Every structure is written in structure tokens, then in C-alpha cells.
Amino acid sequence: KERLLDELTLEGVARYMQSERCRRVICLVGAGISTSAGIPDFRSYDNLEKYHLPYPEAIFEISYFKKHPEPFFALAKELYPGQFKPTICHYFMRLLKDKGLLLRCYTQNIDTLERIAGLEQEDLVEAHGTFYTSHCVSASCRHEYPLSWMKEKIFSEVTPKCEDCQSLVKPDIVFFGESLPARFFSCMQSDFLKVDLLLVMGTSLQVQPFASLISKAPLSTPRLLINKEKAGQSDPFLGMIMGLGGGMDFDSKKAYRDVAWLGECDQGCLALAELLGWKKELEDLVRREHASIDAQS
């Protein structure tokens, strides 16, 4: 449609971010933006070997969870909010919020580091759920359990059983085979009508239907990929139908709006901030926030 970047580079994106058109930015973030916090990317020493799974992917599958929930809860104790501090990438999105640029952040992560970084719930679409709320597995029951109730069991190595029907209690985390929250679909419908820039950070786009989000962007909307490798160049598979289009296009002769920056997210965001002139503001924000987190202890 229209080319808005004068150059397909990080410098070209930065220069565009300072233009008058760049009003609304949407972020798609994956596991790569939390690795530098200490949270390993399980999709890429084996962190899962200790659980003796039939296969590493099983720990995130709903059918395996309902029979063998122990490995997940052991991992959940590690992933729990408070065990980690947000990264530079997280606080970069905080800067987007405070400057009024952040329309929405869609996240594949379940570490809630976005929330801790200062992003409010309205700013957030947690595509794969949250640990803040838990429900009973029984459809006849479906009793809701608070965060503190859930937190006590997980840190005490006790599988959370229901207090009514004695069934299993799982955090509202979206496992494979489970349906995504309603917010995801209602937000994706309206958010991508008015987005000026797509920031895809720390994801190889390996999980659906999250990966399909990139096809919802308008044809002229620039899309920047900050990831350890190139991704999203294949069929987005929107609606589980092929041929609809929307795949990333960095290297072809037809490329016009897709920019790939290869490396770690922290360095990617630092580089982008340096170009934008937010370098000092970003560094201060991180150190100040981390100090405030340690102040709670």
C-alpha cells in the first residue's frame, strides 16, 4: 500500500517513531524479552530434565497437566511473580506508555513482568493467561480461588485440590489445547484498526493463534522485529486458513515495511532508545525501579 519508512533499518524506524503519524504502537512480546531476567526460553543444560517428561512440550499441555500436574507446579514456583525483576525491554515498553505511545501489549509470557514494570491491565493483553486467578477443573464446580490461596500451595510443594469437590485447581494459565481468553479476540478486532507501528520483540512466533496477530496490522503499518533470529516470514494462518497473507517480508525485493534487528532484546531496545534520545531516561528508569523492588524484599 504505502511505504512509511524511508529506510528498512532501526534508524529508519526510530526516525519514523518521531514523525507525526506514529501515534499508536502495539507490542507483541515473547519469551526472549525475559531471558535476561533469568527466565529461560523453554521452547528453544535442560531446565525440564528434572521432571522426567515423555517430551519437553508435555509440561505445557492441558491433557498431560490434568493427569500429571506436578511438573508444571514445580516450574510455576520458579516463574511466580516476584522471583524476577523486569528487563530493559519491559521498561522500554514502560517508556512507550508514559509518552502516550503504547496502545496495547500482547504477551505470550506468564511471568507478569509487564505488570511489575508498570504496565496496567488495560494496557495489557495476556494471551496465555495469568497466575493471579485459579479455577477448579470440575465443570460442575468451577470454583474460583484467589492468588494468595494459589501462592501458598505452590511454594509448599502441595498440589492444589478443590475445597468443595476435591478436584484439581489450575491457575488461569492457557495450556496447549485450551481456549484463549475472550479479551484476546475482542481486543485484536479493534486494536489493529488504528495501529501505527508493530513492535515484535522476543518471539519466533511459534505459538498460534498469537503468531497470527501480525496479519491483522494494516498494510502500511511498519513492523519491527527485535529477535535473536528472523521469524514470521511464513503463512500467519489467520483463522486456520491459508493464503490470507500477512507474513513478514524483510529480505525480498518486494519488502517495504518490515525491519529485522537480530540480537538480544535488551541490546535491541537500548540501541533503539539511543537513536530516539531516550537512552538516559531508560537507564534511570530501570535502576530506579529495580531499587524500588529491592526496597520491598
Partner: peptide
């Protein structure tokens, strides 16, 4: 095919 709303991997099948 009918499970778009379901969390999946990037396979072009069900």
C-alpha cells in the same frame, strides 16, 4: 480446522 481459538503450535493442520 475449527480450533483457531485454541492454543496451538505453528503447524498447518489440526
Amino acid at each position: 480446522y475449527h480450533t483457531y481459538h485454541v492454543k496451538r503450535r505453528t503447524n498447518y493442520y489440526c
